[PDB]
Symmetry: C7
Amino acid sequence: LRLELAVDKMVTCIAVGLPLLLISLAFAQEISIGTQISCFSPSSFSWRQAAFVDSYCWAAVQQKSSLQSESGNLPLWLHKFFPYILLLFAILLYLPALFWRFSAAPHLCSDLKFIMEELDKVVEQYLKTKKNSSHLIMKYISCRLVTFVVILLACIYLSYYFSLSSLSDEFLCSIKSGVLKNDSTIPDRFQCKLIAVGIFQLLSLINLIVYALLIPVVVYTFFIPFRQKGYNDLSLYNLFLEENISELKSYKCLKV
Amino acid sequence: LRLELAVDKMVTCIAVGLPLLLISLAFAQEISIGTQISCFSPSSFSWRQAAFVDSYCWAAVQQKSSLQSESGNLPLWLHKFFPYILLLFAILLYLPALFWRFSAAPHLCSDLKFIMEELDKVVEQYLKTKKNSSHLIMKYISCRLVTFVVILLACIYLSYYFSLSSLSDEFLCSIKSGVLKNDSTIPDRFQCKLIAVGIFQLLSLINLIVYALLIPVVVYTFFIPFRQKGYNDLSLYNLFLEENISELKSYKCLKV
Amino acid sequence: LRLELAVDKMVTCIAVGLPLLLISLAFAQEISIGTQISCFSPSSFSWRQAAFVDSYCWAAVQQKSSLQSESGNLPLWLHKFFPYILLLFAILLYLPALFWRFSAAPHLCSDLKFIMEELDKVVEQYLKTKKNSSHLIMKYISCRLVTFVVILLACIYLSYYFSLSSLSDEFLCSIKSGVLKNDSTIPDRFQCKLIAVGIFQLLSLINLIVYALLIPVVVYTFFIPFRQKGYNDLSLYNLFLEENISELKSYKCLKV
Amino acid sequence: LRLELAVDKMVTCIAVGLPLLLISLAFAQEISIGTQISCFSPSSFSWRQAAFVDSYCWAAVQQKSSLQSESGNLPLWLHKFFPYILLLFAILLYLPALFWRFSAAPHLCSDLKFIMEELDKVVEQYLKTKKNSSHLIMKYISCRLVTFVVILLACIYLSYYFSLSSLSDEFLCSIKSGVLKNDSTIPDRFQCKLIAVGIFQLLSLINLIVYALLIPVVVYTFFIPFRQKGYNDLSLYNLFLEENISELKSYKCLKV
Amino acid sequence: LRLELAVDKMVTCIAVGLPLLLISLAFAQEISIGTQISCFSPSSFSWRQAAFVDSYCWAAVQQKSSLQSESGNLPLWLHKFFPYILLLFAILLYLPALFWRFSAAPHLCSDLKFIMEELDKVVEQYLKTKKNSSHLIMKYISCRLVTFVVILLACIYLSYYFSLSSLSDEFLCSIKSGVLKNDSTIPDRFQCKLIAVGIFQLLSLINLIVYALLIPVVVYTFFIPFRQKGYNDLSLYNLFLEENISELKSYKCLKV
Amino acid sequence: LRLELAVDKMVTCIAVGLPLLLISLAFAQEISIGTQISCFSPSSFSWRQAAFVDSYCWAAVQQKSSLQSESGNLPLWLHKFFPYILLLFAILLYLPALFWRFSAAPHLCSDLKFIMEELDKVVEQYLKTKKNSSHLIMKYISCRLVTFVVILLACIYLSYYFSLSSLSDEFLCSIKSGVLKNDSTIPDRFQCKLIAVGIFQLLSLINLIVYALLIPVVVYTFFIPFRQKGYNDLSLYNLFLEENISELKSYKCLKV
Amino acid sequence: LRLELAVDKMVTCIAVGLPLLLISLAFAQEISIGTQISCFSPSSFSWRQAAFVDSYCWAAVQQKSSLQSESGNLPLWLHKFFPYILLLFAILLYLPALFWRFSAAPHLCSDLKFIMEELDKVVEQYLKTKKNSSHLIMKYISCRLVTFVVILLACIYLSYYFSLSSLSDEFLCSIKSGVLKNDSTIPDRFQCKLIAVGIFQLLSLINLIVYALLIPVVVYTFFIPFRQKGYNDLSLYNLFLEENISELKSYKCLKV
């Protein structure tokens, strides 16, 4: 028996898998390249001093006092945490489906089975009572609206992230804080690079295109009365029946 | 049968999975970056001497004698054991559900089956006797209260951890202890960084927001008498039936 | 029952498996060699300075300001993202089959079961009504056309990628931007190599040959009336029956 | 049909999983940090010589002749083998459950099934004969006592281990034994650190707290006659029935 | 039911698994050594410069401009792509069996079930009609011929590959291309070695011997009229029956 | 049915798992420490020369000519192959149980089922004929004796291994063989360490204690007539019936 | 049913698993030590130059021109390919059992089921006809003979491999070929070691002992007439019946 429509499950699967697939590709590239940041330290620096510079600048991306970037410090904030936000979007998009299957799936399952059993025998009072009620349709529309809002916010974020200048992956960092402040052997600023930024912007473009094409599909899902071929549980039950009526032989015989 | 309510199941699933998911991402970042601490040692130091400095300062965070930090030794202590506390919270939140499914699921399942079978035939004395009793409701409320207290403590900890100044990941360490005390070639103090601190604070913020949103949900779960749409087993049985009444065709027939 | 034709399933499996197999082999080479780019930096450069040059040139293949390549910066752009586009093609070729299985396969399954159960007894009006409809055939042809267009675009891309000159993996890069601009110790240009390009072009040739062989197969699939042995659901139902009639003993009895 | 009480299963699961979970966390931290010991060696030493010093001091932890430590040789010995003892405790606590599930489990299962099948036909002589016997109760109490003794020994060990001074992770070692004795280029003593000591002590504290909480639970399990709501098989069969009586509909009818 | 003969399945399994097994051994050896090429570079070269030389010469095996080899650049091309050709052979040998299973196996299964059931009378026209047809024998012979041709081409390739002189793994390479052309500090030619070549030639000898032994087996499969103990579809049915007739009790009784 | 006794299953499980568990711990430590042998070579040696010294000394533990050890070359030989002997014991202890399961389990199962089916109806002649026979008892005693002998040999070995002096992990090696013999820049002897020896001795002590405790259990299993509550199949059948009689309700009814 | 005798399946499992287990141990040791070959190169050699020497010598074992070994160049060839030959033996020993299960198991199963069903009712003519035939006994003896010959060849190879002198792991190599021939800075010969030779010889000894013990077992299997308790299918069927007769209660009833 089906408790989720084909278009809804397609949308959920795309919106959840795509961010995770892109995260997997980004992680593979990260392990392949070996570093998400690289700083140019002097040749007098030993290997561990250069590694300290790299790690300090990586940790200093989130600190105001030791950075200088032409695009501002917000772009450098986002480059470091890009995969985290993608997984956050994936979880937030997967949750509404989880809540629907936990809460409303069983009640709709029972109602559909009861309707299909009263059908195949001919229940009008049951259908009219559902027409009066607006319980399940409210849950369905609320879940779809949460999904739509999450997708819209993801589109806004990915459009902003892709908007960041390609040279936003460069920044100047200073390690001369604390005891190192008066170290005359350390240069004042180090030129750093965020290596993965180039991958992240193309991944954001891909996800943005997919979500922009997916938004109209989600919008079409709200017009539940129009999909049926007012806003009441009767309308949603009708849609589920038509998507499910293929399993009722009597329906096919009547169609003939 | 549904021996656990949808709200309880979703709350437990979120409260347990989220810390584990954040720990997984933190571990992925830890392996990607490669170091949880980087110390700036002289250029004259060999690579093994610099590695010794790093490992000594990593283990010296818990030692008050050989450190100097403006935020105190306590915040530096927390930075080192952040993921472990997350796993501790995950275990402490998963345990109450485990105890419920071990010590209360069978007895509730048997009672529900008996009530459902005595129904579908029409038991009043059984329901009144349950109204007198207060056994299962006490277990349910105790488990919910344990979960609520654990979540409140997690919120307090994560609000404290996120409150630590971003510059609390820096500290001065000394290795000149023991035979190294008279070594004039070793600097008195080394500048250290806790690299993962920046990401740990964002993870703490995410978990804090999620748990702060979950607290009102858990609080609403306590009012078992008001969730029906006194504090006795009759109320819990009524809630479980209404959540599970969908599995009886006679109920739907009567509703029609 | 079979809701997907043998040739269609073969084509989908080949088209969605070959790019993934090539991606797996490319990943194997990437891990084996350990570097996707190698730059020749002075001997005075420390190890970490040379690593910075390598990673900076890796991140600067997507930036015009820091490149000088005889074949243009577009071919160098493609060399970096070749494995991603293979997975893009794999997903775009797997999606139509999944959408067919989700939104068209069960209805055809029910229709075939009804037809076979009505047969084995002799329904003519049902078949004529299907002849008077173009619902499922439109979905089938749309999915086949989407697959054909995706395969044609993949062929065009792979033919272009394979056309890139073998020496297109070489390019000159400069790290002297920003603070490093006035550094007289850094050479103006570094000679870089894209090592995986040699593997990628042979993989592209293999995929191009396979997809060019598949194009005629996909084209033959469009002529649904010819495979039957007009453009309406009757032809598709007839084809599916003849492919699946083997599971009807009465058909064999009539054959003999 | 539950052949193990809920309290016993909970106790066994906690006592076995917790040491394994702590071992997993310790192993992850050991991999992430990369060194269980770091020794400070002269800068004249090549890297292989410093690695030899580290390995020799790691192997010399168990050799009194070549080490000097103010806390004694025993605490340094324990730091090296902490996870091994944790797994030893885990195995020793899992074994009694294994022995109970192999022997005395099928016998109790058969006896319970016979008693329940004789019930629903209302056996008194059978219950009285079991009252005379003291066979299965002896095995149950022996297993519980073994578990209690193992938990008490684990508590004693963990309380001792946590009691070790934090500075017990430092010790002086000499590699000048054998052909290296007269090597004037090697310093007499090297300062060593055990990096995982600080984490191991927190893990020991966690396990100690959990096991100290479990001890009263285990002690409560011995009073089998008082858990009813003399020491004979009847007193154990009664408890197992009350735990498993939920699967007897006639019992619920009689209760009503 | 056996839809594919024992000899056919044996041949397919050997011809597919053996190349994959050899690929697994080759990959294990490659990871064991870590380098598929090693070039001797001056001691003045830094380690990163020598790594660049190694990678450049690895990528320069496919380029005529920067290579000198007495055996020609063709043998050097093959050494780099030996496992790829093995996997190509494995896929090309697995495909015909896949197509047989997808497009011919079910029809033969249905025919066998029909004829088997009729033979259990306790049908002559069906057998004669099959004798007057070649629909399935043509498919079987086409698949066998494709497999035979693929195996013959694999034998030719492996015999050629093994024929390459053992010294063919050596070649001279020049990195002085582009800005490096006028670098007087770089030697004109670097001697290179393909380390895996020694493994690859023995793996090729093993595979060549196995496929040379399999060729007569495959050739024997074409004489379908002779295996039964003319070229028409009846003969294939006879062979499949004799293979599968062991499941008919009536056949054994008649044999007695 | 239980074709193997609880005591025998426990003994086999312990004897097989314990060596494998200790091997797993040893392997984990080996990978964590990163080296099984450390040798002190001059500082003039480059890193690769010191690595050659380490590997040559590792390979020369089995060669008498190039080593001088205080405890003899035999103890140094054992240190290198300790885990392999543990796995050898594991295999040799798992084999007898496998041979029993493959050569006595089916006949025993059939005999037990026949006896149980003839019982539950009341066969005396069958039991007397079994009394007049020693077929299965010989197999059982032979398997138990093989297990006992293997355990005794393992105890002897582990007691010998644990008896090796702690300083047996040190030895002197010379690489000056062949062309290196006349090299005056190489020290005549190098000081080596077998690092894992200290852990291997504790693992041997653990296994020795476990097997010493297990020997009396195995010896008790030989007295098959005494466990029954002469050396012929009757006693063995009686033992397996008494262990298995719990699955016979008629037995319990008669016992009452 | 049991289509494979216990002794035969024991022999196959041992002969196939033991080489695989030894190969697994060898691979674990190879990864732990990290090198299969180590050459002593001058201290003036860079790291990459010494690595080139090691790789060239590894690839030069299969080349007569550039080596000098007093034990012959054949033994050095074998040391490099020991695990490959072990896997070859494993495959060649697993193949006969697989072919038997492919081309003998179904017919034998059908014949055994027919014989058992005709029995349990009393077929004499069937057994007498089998008395003359030799179809299946020939297959059985051929498979056993192939297994015996493979085991004998494995014993010969392992006895030869173990006979190689322990010092056969040392050899001199020259890298001065081609361009390097006139390099006066490279020594004429490098002393090399094959580190895994010492372990490989013990593994060969273990496998040799096991296979030498297995040869008499395999020889005993040929005498099919004597295993009964002439050379025709009647004897083989009788043996399989006596091994399989335990699954026929009528046989036990007659035995009583």
